[PDB]
Scaffold this active site. Sequence first.
Site, PDB file in Angstrom:
ATOM      1  N   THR A   1       0.847  -1.200   0.000  1.00  0.00           N
ATOM      2  CA  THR A   1       0.000   0.000   0.000  1.00  0.00           C
ATOM      3  C   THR A   1       0.873   1.237   0.000  1.00  0.00           C
ATOM      4  O   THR A   1       2.088   1.104   0.287  1.00  0.00           O
ATOM      5  CB  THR A   1      -1.012  -0.097   1.188  1.00  0.00           C
ATOM      6  OG1 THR A   1      -0.322   0.388   2.363  1.00  0.00           O
ATOM      7  CG2 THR A   1      -1.530  -1.520   1.387  1.00  0.00           C
ATOM      8  N   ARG A  21      -8.796   3.771  -0.648  1.00  0.00           N
ATOM      9  CA  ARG A  21      -8.915   2.333  -0.542  1.00  0.00           C
ATOM     10  C   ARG A  21      -7.795   1.655   0.239  1.00  0.00           C
ATOM     11  O   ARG A  21      -8.028   0.642   0.937  1.00  0.00           O
ATOM     12  CB  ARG A  21      -8.905   1.692  -1.940  1.00  0.00           C
ATOM     13  CG  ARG A  21      -9.997   0.655  -2.138  1.00  0.00           C
ATOM     14  CD  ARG A  21     -11.009   1.207  -3.118  1.00  0.00           C
ATOM     15  NE  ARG A  21     -10.403   1.287  -4.454  1.00  0.00           N
ATOM     16  CZ  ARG A  21     -10.975   2.013  -5.426  1.00  0.00           C
ATOM     17  NH1 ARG A  21     -12.133   2.656  -5.234  1.00  0.00           N
ATOM     18  NH2 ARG A  21     -10.324   2.079  -6.600  1.00  0.00           N
ATOM     19  N   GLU A  22      -6.600   2.204   0.123  1.00  0.00           N
ATOM     20  CA  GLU A  22      -5.430   1.630   0.805  1.00  0.00           C
ATOM     21  C   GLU A  22      -5.062   2.137   2.173  1.00  0.00           C
ATOM     22  O   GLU A  22      -4.717   1.305   3.029  1.00  0.00           O
ATOM     23  CB  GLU A  22      -4.202   1.894  -0.078  1.00  0.00           C
ATOM     24  CG  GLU A  22      -3.981   0.736  -1.067  1.00  0.00           C
ATOM     25  CD  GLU A  22      -3.035   1.162  -2.163  1.00  0.00           C
ATOM     26  OE1 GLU A  22      -1.900   1.628  -1.905  1.00  0.00           O
ATOM     27  OE2 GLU A  22      -3.548   1.007  -3.272  1.00  0.00           O
ATOM     28  N   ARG A  25      -6.052   0.226   5.406  1.00  0.00           N
ATOM     29  CA  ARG A  25      -5.435  -1.088   5.631  1.00  0.00           C
ATOM     30  C   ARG A  25      -4.334  -1.041   6.686  1.00  0.00           C
ATOM     31  O   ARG A  25      -3.857  -2.056   7.202  1.00  0.00           O
ATOM     32  CB  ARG A  25      -4.838  -1.643   4.344  1.00  0.00           C
ATOM     33  CG  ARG A  25      -5.797  -2.203   3.315  1.00  0.00           C
ATOM     34  CD  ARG A  25      -5.200  -2.184   1.927  1.00  0.00           C
ATOM     35  NE  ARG A  25      -6.138  -2.627   0.956  1.00  0.00           N
ATOM     36  CZ  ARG A  25      -6.447  -2.361  -0.296  1.00  0.00           C
ATOM     37  NH1 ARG A  25      -5.859  -1.452  -1.062  1.00  0.00           N
ATOM     38  NH2 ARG A  25      -7.456  -3.060  -0.881  1.00  0.00           N
TER      39      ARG A  25
END
Length: 137
Positions: A1, A21-22, A25
């Site tokens: 990421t 989106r990353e 994480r």
Amino acid sequence: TQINLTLVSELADQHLMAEYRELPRVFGAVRKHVANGKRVRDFKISPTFILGAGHVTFFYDKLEFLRKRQIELIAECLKRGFNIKDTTVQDISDIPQEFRGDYIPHEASIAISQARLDEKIAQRPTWYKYYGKAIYA
């Protein structure tokens, strides 16, 4: 990421979406770490922002700077008219105070981050858009 230091508002639509989106994480990796009994003391967290190899671990004691950035990545996605289904910041008050530190990049850190985005672009720019426009040559 990958995590960027640039103004999310200057992020190519594709970079805006991927980061969005990353970034999150990082919260899950730390939840995992903390469930195996790891603490900040167990990680090699670079004193200075880097891109390669210990990039993500660099943000492991900076989850508060990440959280405020998540807020900014969501706001920029709605602003552009992207249909994102996750419009709420992640609740990370469950992570020990030790990993939830803030951060404030130096213009030289940021410059590092800009050049990586910038060279991704120039790779094949017909692939990148800004507010769905191809302004990248």
